[PDB]
């Protein structure tokens, strides 16, 4: 039998993760230019 839980008025069952089923160089600020507008 499949275990069924209850959370805030909702039924809950264990689900499969199905991971197979479905799915940089940092630039310093000192170098960057600034322009208050």
């Amino acid at each position: 039998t499949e275990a069924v839980g209850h959370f805030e008025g909702r039924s809950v069952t264990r689900a499969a993760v199905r991971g197979e089923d479905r799915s940089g160089d940092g630039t310093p600020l000192e170098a960057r230019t600034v322009r208050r507008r």
Binding site: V4, R10, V12, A16, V17, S23
Partner: protein, 133 residues
Amino acid sequence: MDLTSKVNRLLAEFAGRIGLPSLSLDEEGMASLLFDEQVGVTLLLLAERERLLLEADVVGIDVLGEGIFRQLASFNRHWHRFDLHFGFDELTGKVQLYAQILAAQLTLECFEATLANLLDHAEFWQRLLPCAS
């Protein structure tokens, strides 16, 4: 005690509350649930950034009329008002809401509250978005 086991401890207590025998994270640190046989939720532990991710399947793209992606983007502009933003999974065709919890505020109370809220909105956009009538 590492972060993974700290969260596994929280998921074990959460399980005991709702009536599931057990609940833990994958080798990839993932765990999925199914609410009312309709809304699927997936837990994602990012040990690197120390934060828990929460994915929620809202609706299928097949029941949605076009032009909605724009109204979803307009939402993300004010995501800070609900701490939730929209995303899409091309492989599944499911619209998803995302919520995160910093390891600093990760408690049982906070986890259940964030989940209940995520479901509240997910069920709302699941009943609203469809145009099939």
